[PDB]
Design a binder for this molecule. Structure first.
Ligand SMILES: *C(=O)[C@@H](NC(=O)Cc1cccs1)[C@@H]1NC(C(=O)O)=C(/C=C/c2ccc([N+](=O)[O-])cc2[N+](=O)[O-])CS1
Ligand SMILES: *C(=O)[C@@H](NC(=O)Cc1cccs1)[C@@H]1NC(C(=O)O)=C(/C=C/c2ccc([N+](=O)[O-])cc2[N+](=O)[O-])CS1
Length: 491
């Protein structure tokens, strides 16, 4: 026969933004065998079987029914030294090829972002899949002719070296990723919740600094792996963002020319009839509220009446421009786009629902990206999961004046009240949402020069919006300090 013998390539190293290893190709031994040669040394089979801890008769049966085949694995991806224990038997037809297996040093802490490789050392999930073309490199080649018993008869013509894959530096900071993983895991146990997501973005660069989900898994130990636990929820799970989009409804109002923060809406009696449909506030002891008051009293009635005044088109436009229901450009296969509905004529019911964040569906990544644009004085920088050394130009999606006013309003949402999101030493700005409940918090800090945007989503808390705020407060306090951001609550 003439046979191609592929030479394994070294898969590219994945690191942290700081160069901390997240995915490393480990040298391993792959005991294969040439059945046709084994078939001439059957008295050695029981020993070899015991070494591979297989049943003697199952092993025997395997080799016998593969007697015509020149190639089969005994144990793929065995560790070396153990594999030198079997080569030690000197059993005819039993060989070794040096192979590469992925090790994930940070295991479960960054499982969804980094992902893992299939059996063939090919990317299957997360960055490993999305950058498979970059990380894979090029296998080398031997071309061999073989004996009738499958032995290497030489005439090998022009062995290729094999091209290694390139190293890739993520935008992820492993110090913020650990802090986010630990606080989200603790939040789920405290609040008895099922699942959750936490994204941290750099508002100046578009870099995702942290992306964690619960449940998680150990990518080094995928024995008892729940498909559930493998879900990168931050990028795959769409939800109604609800009240967390009210800052965008306020942005459209402030850009209309018809609204300033001190203008008043009468929300009495805390409900509003739309034909048959009835919009309903949770607290219904308000009459006149200004725009900051509408966010502080969580009035759906107030945001609905402003939306009727400015039109859904202006609200639709801001939401689309900040990337809600829009392709993120990260080209992670399976990443969801969600749904921002569009109409020629926006009826009253759909205008109100859009404005308070019902009837659209977004990902945690999209919402973080939208808060990032708002935090970055209305300028949207492109999302990246890889380290950004040279920052692309942002698109101005909200006017700097409007963005700056909405930042101010969201800082009074966090401050004016106290306890019930506060980040001691820093001015933080944020908005809670509550959509089987989902608890949301979206925010950014510090208010004087925003650095970080963060989204917290918690799925079905039991031990009871206000389950999300304390996670935000704790992760933001830690993230800003890990990034040496100077505290901005100054006299
Ligand atoms: C925006 O998401 C609004 N949510 C709704 O109108 C849908 C719901 C009505 C009642 C509950 S779901 C407004 N935003 C918020 C918010 O900003 O958090 C809420 C919060 C509701 C909430 C949160 C926690 C608790 N709790 O004590 O555990 C109780 C409530 N609640 O009073 O329902 C809803 S209005
Ligand atoms: C609407 O329901 C109000 N929020 C609540 O009282 C329910 C909560 C959700 C999470 C925590 S409280 C108004 N809406 C918002 C908002 O947009 O989130 C706020 C919240 C005020 C507030 C005050 C103090 C603190 N704190 O712990 O330091 C945090 C918040 N906060 O949750 O944003 C105005 S009340």
């Amino acid at each position: 026969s003439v046979r191609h013998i592929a030479i394994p390539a070294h898969r590219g190293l994945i690191t942290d933004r700081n160069g901390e290893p997240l995915a490393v190709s480990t040298p391993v031994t792959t005991l294969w065998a040439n059945p046709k040669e084994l078939m001439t040394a059957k008295e050695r089979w029981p020993q070899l079987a015991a070494a591979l801890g297989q049943d003697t008769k199952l092993f025997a049966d395997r080799i016998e029914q593969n007697a015509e085949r020149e190639f089969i694995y005994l144990v793929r991806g065995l560790t070396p030294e153990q594999g030198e224990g079997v080569i030690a038997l000197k059993v005819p037809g039993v060989y070794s090829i040096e192979e590469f297996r992925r090790f994930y040093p940070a295991g479960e802490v960054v499982a969804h972002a980094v992902g893992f490789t299939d059996v063939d050392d090919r990317g299957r999930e997360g960055i490993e899949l999305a950058f498979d073309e970059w990380l894979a490199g090029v296998p080398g080649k031997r071309q061999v002719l073989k004996d009738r018993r499958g032995r290497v008869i030489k005439d090998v013509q022009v062995t290729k070296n094999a091209k290694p894959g390139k190293t890739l530096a993520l935008s992820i900071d492993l110090r913020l990723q650990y802090l986010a993983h630990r606080e989200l895991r603790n939040a789920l146990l405290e609040n008895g919740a099922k699942a959750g997501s936490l994204v941290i973005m750099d508002v100046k660069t578009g870099e995702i600094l942290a992306m964690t989900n619960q449940p998680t898994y150990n990518p080094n130990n995928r024995r008892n792996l729940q498909p559930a636990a493998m879900r990168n929820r931050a990028m795959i799970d769409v939800f109604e963002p609800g009240s967390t989009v009210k800052p965008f409804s306020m942005s459209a109002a402030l850009a209309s020319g018809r609204w300033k923060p001190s203008d008043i809406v009468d929300v009495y009696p805390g409900t509003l009839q739309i034909g048959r449909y009835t919009i309903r506030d949770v607290s219904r002891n308000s009459r006149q509220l200004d725009l900051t008051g509408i966010l502080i009293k969580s009035s759906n009635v107030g945001i609905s009446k402003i939306a009727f005044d400015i039109g859904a088109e202006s609200i639709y436009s801001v939401m689309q421009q900040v990337g809600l229901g829009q392709d993120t450009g990260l080209g992670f296969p399976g990443e969801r786009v969600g749904n921002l509905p569009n109409h020629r004529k926006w009826p009253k019911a759909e205008t109100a629902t859009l404005a308070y964040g019902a009837g659209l569906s977004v990902t945690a990544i999209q919402l973080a990206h939208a808060y990032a644009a708002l935090a970055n004085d209305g300028k949207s920088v492109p999302l990246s999961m890889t380290r950004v050394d040279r920052v692309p130009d942002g698109v101005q999606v909200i006017s700097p004046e409007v963005a700056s006013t909405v930042q101010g309003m969201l800082q009074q949402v966090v401050e004016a009240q106290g306890g019930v999101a506060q980040v001691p030493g820093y001015h933080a700005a944020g908005k809670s949402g509550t959509a089987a409940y989902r608890s949301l918090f979206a925010g950014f800090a510090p208010a004087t020069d925003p650095r970080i945007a963060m989204v917290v989503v918690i799925d079905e808390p039991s031990k009871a919006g206000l389950v999300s705020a304390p996670v935000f407060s704790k992760v933001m306090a830690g993230a800003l300090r890990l990034m040496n951001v100077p505290p901005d609550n100054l006299p």
